[PDB]
Scaffold this active site. Structure first.
Site, short mmCIF file in Angstrom:
data_model
loop_
_atom_site.label_atom_id
_atom_site.label_comp_id
_atom_site.label_asym_id
_atom_site.label_seq_id
_atom_site.Cartn_x
_atom_site.Cartn_y
_atom_site.Cartn_z
N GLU A 23 0.89 -1.18 0.00
CA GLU A 23 0.00 0.00 0.00
C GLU A 23 0.91 1.21 0.00
O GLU A 23 2.11 1.07 0.31
CB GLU A 23 -0.95 -0.02 1.19
CG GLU A 23 -0.25 0.27 2.47
CD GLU A 23 -1.14 0.23 3.70
OE1 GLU A 23 -2.19 0.93 3.72
OE2 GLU A 23 -0.72 -0.43 4.66
N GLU A 351 -9.15 -6.01 6.46
CA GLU A 351 -9.32 -6.08 7.94
C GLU A 351 -10.77 -5.73 8.32
O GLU A 351 -10.98 -4.82 9.16
CB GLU A 351 -8.32 -5.13 8.63
CG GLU A 351 -6.88 -5.58 8.46
CD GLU A 351 -5.90 -5.10 9.54
OE1 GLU A 351 -6.12 -3.98 10.09
OE2 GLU A 351 -4.88 -5.81 9.76
O1 LIG Z 1 0.73 -2.75 7.31
C1 LIG Z 1 0.22 -1.60 7.97
C2 LIG Z 1 -1.25 -1.74 8.34
N1 LIG Z 1 -1.59 -2.90 9.20
C3 LIG Z 1 -3.02 -3.17 9.15
C4 LIG Z 1 -3.46 -2.55 7.83
O2 LIG Z 1 -4.14 -3.48 7.02
C5 LIG Z 1 -2.20 -1.99 7.16
O3 LIG Z 1 -2.51 -0.78 6.46
#
Ligand SMILES: OC[C@@H]1NC[C@H](O)[C@H]1O
Ligand SMILES: *[C@@H]1O[C@H](CO)[C@@H](O[C@@H]2O[C@H](CO)[C@@H](O[C@@H]3O[C@H](CO)[C@@H](O)[C@H](O)[C@@H]3O)[C@H](O)[C@H]2NC(C)=O)[C@H](O)[C@H]1NC(C)=O
Ligand SMILES: *[C@@H]1O[C@H](CO)[C@@H](O[C@@H]2O[C@H](CO)[C@@H](O)[C@H](O)[C@H]2NC(C)=O)[C@H](O)[C@H]1NC(C)=O
Ligand SMILES: *[C@@H]1O[C@H](CO)[C@@H](O[C@@H]2O[C@H](CO)[C@@H](O)[C@H](O)[C@H]2NC(C)=O)[C@H](O)[C@H]1NC(C)=O
Ligand SMILES: *[C@@H]1O[C@H](CO)[C@@H](O[C@@H]2O[C@H](CO)[C@@H](O)[C@H](O)[C@H]2NC(C)=O)[C@H](O)[C@H]1NC(C)=O
Ligand SMILES: [Cl-]
Length: 627
Positions: A23, A351
Site C-alpha cells: 500500500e 481487515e
Molecule cells: O501494514 C500496515 C497496516 N496494518 C493493518 C493494515 O491493514 C495496514 O494498512
C-alpha cells in the site's frame, strides 16, 4: 538434534507461497516505488490560497506564488493551478523550486525528463526563455534547459525538456527549479499545472518505477503482489476510498485522493502501472476491492451496496475482461494492453474484523455477485477465521499478525492443528515489530523496532518454516509493511527503507529472500522441531533438478547442532552451498550502516549424513542435490 529427511513428498508447495504486500504507506508509492521526483506536483486535494496548498514549493527571489482554483483549469481532474507573478521592477533570476520528497538525487549518469503545463491567463507582449533545471539547495545550478515562450499563449501548453547534470551532487539536498528573467518578466502572471520530473525508470517504462527500489523487490524473487491495501484501500469515508478508474488514463485525468496515512496520493501509481510491474517481474496479483467499509467507522447499509459491487466488477474487468464485452476491458486495450493480465485471487475489503457486524452482508452480496461474473477467481475473506460465520463459505482467509520476535518462534506450529477442509490461508501481513509484549504498537523507547533486527528476522524465519510445512493449506505469505521513506515514516519496522538517494535492505528482507529464492515444488517431511523451541527447519526439493533446500531458523541465544540423515535417498551430492544470515541479536541495517548484516555463502561437505552448528540468531539455507 538428529533430523531424518523423508524422500517421499507429502504435498506440492504452492508457487504463490512467498510474496509482497503493498500500500502507499511511509511514502512507499508517491516518493518511493513511483519514480516521480516532484512532491505535490499538481496541487491535488489541497485548499486554494493556503500555505498547505504550496507544500514542497518555494519562491526564488521576489516571486509571488499562490495555488488558485483556476477559472480555466488544465483538466476537470486538476482544478488547482500555481499562479506565478513577477513584481514590477524585478531583475535577475525569478521563479520557484520544488524540494522533492525530502531531496532529489542529482546524478550526471542520468537523463531527467521535466514537464509542466502553462498558460498566460491575460495575453501579454512577454517574449523570453522559460528555464527548468536542478540546483543544490545553496542555489548552485547542476542542470538546466530552456525554451522560448510568448505572453500571447493563453491556452494550456505542455513544455517537455530533458536535463543533463554537469556534476553529480554530493548529497540529496537539491531542488527542481523554474525561472524567467526578472526584468523581461516584470509584471507578468503565468498559471502552471501538472508538473513532473522523472529519472530513468525500471524497464524504461513511461510513468514507471524507481530503479533501485524496483530491482530490490525483484531481487527477493516474489511470486505475488497484494495491493492496493491495506488501510490505503479503505479511505476515511466512502468518498475518499481508493477507486480504480481515477487511477487510469492520462495524468491530466487523475484527480488524486487523500490516502489513509496523512498525505495526498497522486494516483500516478495506478492500476495499469501496478499490472505492468507484475508482468515485468513475473508476479501475480492478489488484488483487493473496496467492500463498503471506511476507516471513519461507516459501513454502507445492505441496500446501498449495488453501485460499489458494480465498481468492483469494473475493476476486475479492467484486469482480465474481454475488450469486446466491457468498457473497462476496452480501456485496458485502448491504453495499449489488449491481452488480459493474470488474476486468480481477489480480497474483499481489508481487515473487516473492524466491522464484523456488517461484513456478513457485505461479504455475501459482494462474493455472490463477483463469483457469478468471475467463476475462476478465489475470493479471500478478511474477518477473523470462522468468527463471524460467513456465507458463502470462504475458500480463503487473510490472517494478519504483528507480535514479538519470541511470539513468532513460539507460534511456528500455528497452522499444524488446522483442519484440512478445502480452506486456504493467506498470511497477508506479518512482522515482529517490538520486543515489548505489553506495548506492541508503542514508541522505540518502549521496545518498538525502528528497523528489523537479527532477533526479529530469525523469529520470523522460524514462523516461516511453519508456513512452508503447512503449505498444503497456507498458499501465500507477505511481510508488512514492505517500504519506508526514512524522511516520512508512519509505521516501523519495514522490510526495505530508503531516502531520495539509496536503499537499505533489512535483516528481515534477507530472511524473505533466502526463503523465497531457495524453494522446491515438493515438501519433504522431516523430524518435527520442538513446538515452543527456538530451533526450526523446513525442507523442500525441486522435482526437475533434485535441488534440495534445507532452511534452518535459530531464533534463540544458544548455538544448536543439527545432524541430517538422508539415508532414504539413492544419492546425495558430496558438497552443498551454505547461505547464512547472522549477527548480534539487536543488530540492524540502518541508513548510517546499511551493510552491517548481510548473508555469507560458502561450500560445505555433504552426503547421507552431515552436521551443521546453527549459530544463535541465524537463518541458514543448505542446498544439496538428492535423488
Ligand atoms: O501494514 C500496515 C497496516 N496494518 C493493518 C493494515 O491493514 C495496514 O494498512
Ligand atoms: C469512477 O467510477 C465511479 C463509478 O464506479 C464514479 O462514481 C460515481 O460518480 C457518479 C457521478 O458523480 C455518481 O452519481 C452522482 O451521485 C450523486 C449523489 O446521489 C448525485 O447528486 C448525482 O446527480 C449523480 O447521480 C455515482 O454515485 C458514483 N458512484 C459510486 C459507486 O461512487 C466516479 O466518479 C469515477 N471517478 C472518476 C474520477 O471519474
Ligand atoms: C532540452 O530538452 C530538449 C527536449 O527534450 C532536448 O532535445 C531533445 O533531445 C533528445 C535526445 O537527443 C531527442 O530525442 C529529442 O528529439 C530532442 N527534442 C527536441 C524537441 O529537440 C535537448 O537535448 C535539451 N537540451 C539540453 C541542453 O539539455
Ligand atoms: C474447516 O475447519 C475449521 C476448524 O474446525 C472450521 O471452523 C469452525 O467453523 C465454525 C463455523 O462454521 C465455527 O463456529 C468454529 O469455531 C470453527 N472452528 C474453529 C476451531 O475455528 C470450518 O468451519 C471448516 N470449514 C469447512 C469448509 O468445512
Ligand atoms: C532523512 O533521513 C536521513 C537518515 O536519517 C537524514 O540523514 C541523517 O541525519 C542524522 C541526524 O539528523 C545524522 O546524524 C545522520 O548521519 C544522517 N544519516 C545519513 C545516512 O545521512 C536526513 O537528514 C533526513 N533528511 C531530511 C531532509 O530530513
Ligand atoms: Cl521478544
Amino acid at each position: 538434534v538428529t533430523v531424518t529427511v523423508n524422500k517421499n513428498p507429502s504435498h506440492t508447495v504452492p508457487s504463490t507461497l512467498y510474496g509482497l504486500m503493498f500500500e502507499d504507506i511511509n511514502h512507499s508509492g508517491d516518493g518511493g516505488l513511483y519514480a516521480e521526483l516532484l512532491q505535490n506536483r499538481a496541487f491535488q486535494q489541497v485548499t486554494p490560497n493556503t500555505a498547505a496548498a504550496l507544500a514542497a514549493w518555494h519562491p526564488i527571489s521576489n516571486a509571488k506564488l499562490a495555488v488558485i482554483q483556476d477559472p480555466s483549469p488544465v483538466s476537470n481532474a486538476l482544478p488547482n493551478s500555481l499562479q506565478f507573478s513577477v513584481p514590477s521592477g524585478s531583475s535577475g533570476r525569478v521563479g520557484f523550486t520544488n524540494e522533492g520528497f525530502w531531496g532529489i538525487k542529482v546524478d550526471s549518469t542520468w537523463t531527467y525528463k521535466a514537464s509542466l503545463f502553462f498558460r498566460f491567463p491575460t495575453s501579454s507582449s512577454f517574449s523570453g526563455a522559460l528555464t527548468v533545471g536542478l540546483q543544490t539547495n545553496a542555489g548552485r545550478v547542476l542542470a538546466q534547459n530552456s525554451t522560448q515562450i510568448r505572453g500571447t499563449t493563453t491556452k494550456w501548453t505542455q513544455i517537455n525538456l530533458e536535463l543533463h547534470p554537469t556534476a553529480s551532487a554530493p548529497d540529496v539536498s537539491n531542488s527542481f527549479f523554474v525561472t524567467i528573467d526578472g526584468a523581461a518578466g516584470a509584471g507578468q502572471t503565468i498559471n502552471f499545472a501538472m508538473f513532473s520530473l522523472f529519472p530513468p525508470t525500471f524497464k524504461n517504462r513511461p510513468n514507471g518505477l524507481r530503479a533501485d527500489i524496483a530491482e530490490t523487490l525483484a531481487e527477493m524473487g516474489p511470486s505475488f503482489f497484494r495491493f492496493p491495501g491495506g488501510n490505503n484501500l479503505e479511505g476515511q469515508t466512502t468518498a475518499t476510498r481508493w477507486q480504480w478508474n481515477a487511477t487510469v488514463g492520462s495524468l491530466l485525468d487523475r484527480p488524486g485522493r487523500v490516502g489513509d496515512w496523512g498525505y495526498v496520493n497522486t494516483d500516478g501509481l495506478g492500476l495499469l502501472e501496478y499490472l505492468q510491474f507484475f508482468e515485468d517481474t513475473g508476479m501475480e496479483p492478489i488484488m483487493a476491492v473496496w467492500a463498503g467499509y471506511s476507516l471513519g467507522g461507516t459501513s454502507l447499509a445492505e441496500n446501498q451496496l449495488a453501485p460499489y459491487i458494480q465498481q468492483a466488477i469494473d475493476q476486475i474487468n479492467f484486469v482480465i475482461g474481454d475488450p469486446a464485452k466491457s468498457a473497462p476491458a476496452a480501456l485496458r486495450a485502448s491504453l495499449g494492453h489488449p491481452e488480459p493480465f493474470t488474476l486468480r485471487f481477489v480480497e474483499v475489503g481489508n481487515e473487516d474484523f473492524f466491522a464484523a457486524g456488517s461484513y456478513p452482508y457485505r461479504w455475501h452480496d459482494f462474493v455472490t455477485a463477483l463469483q457469478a461474473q468471475f467463476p475462476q477467481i478465489r475470493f479471500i475473506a478478511t474477518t477473523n477465521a470462522w468468527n463471524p460465520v460467513l456465507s458463502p463459505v470462504p475458500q480463503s482467509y487473510d490472517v494478519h499478525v504483528y507480535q514479538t520476535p519470541t511470539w513468532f518462534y513460539q507460534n511456528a506450529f500455528y497452522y499444524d492443528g488446522f483442519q484440512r477442509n478445502g480452506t486456504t490461508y493467506f498470511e497477508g501481513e506479518y512482522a515482529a515489530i517490538s520486543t515489548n509484549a505489553n506495548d506492541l504498537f508503542g514508541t522505540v523507547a518502549d521496545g518498538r523496532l525502528a528497523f528489523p533486527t537479527v532477533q526479529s528476522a530469525t523469529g520470523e524465519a522460524a514462523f516461516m518454516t511453519g508456513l512452508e510445512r503447512n503449505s498444503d493449506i497456507v498458499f501465500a505469505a507477505s511481510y508488512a509493511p514492505l517500504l519506508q521513506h526514512v524522511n516520512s515514516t508512519q509505521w516501523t519496522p519495514d522490510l526495505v527503507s530508503y531516502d531520495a538517494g539509496s536503499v537499505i535492505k533489512s535483516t528481515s528482507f534477507f530472511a524473505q529472500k533466502l526463503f523465497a529464492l531457495n524453494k522446491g515444488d515438493q515438501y519433504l517431511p522431516s523430524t518435527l522441531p520442538t513446538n515452543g523451541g527456538t530451533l526450526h527447519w523446513s525442507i523442500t526439493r525441486a522435482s526437475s533438478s533434485g535441488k534440495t533446500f534445507i532452511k534452518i531458523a535459530n531464533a534463540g541465544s544458544s548455538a544448536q547442532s543439527l545432524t541430517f540423515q538422508l539415508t532414504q535417498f539413492n544419492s546425495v551430492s558430496s558438497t552443498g552451498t551454505l547461505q547464512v544470515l547472522t549477527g548480534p541479536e539487536t543488530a540492524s541495517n540502518t541508513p548510517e550502516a546499511p551493510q552491517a548484516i548481510v548473508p555469507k555463502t560458502s561450500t560445505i561437505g555433504t552426503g547421507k549424513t552431515f552436521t551443521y552448528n546453527a549459530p544463535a540468531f541465524s537463518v541458514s539455507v543448505i542446498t544439496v542435490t538428492t535423488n
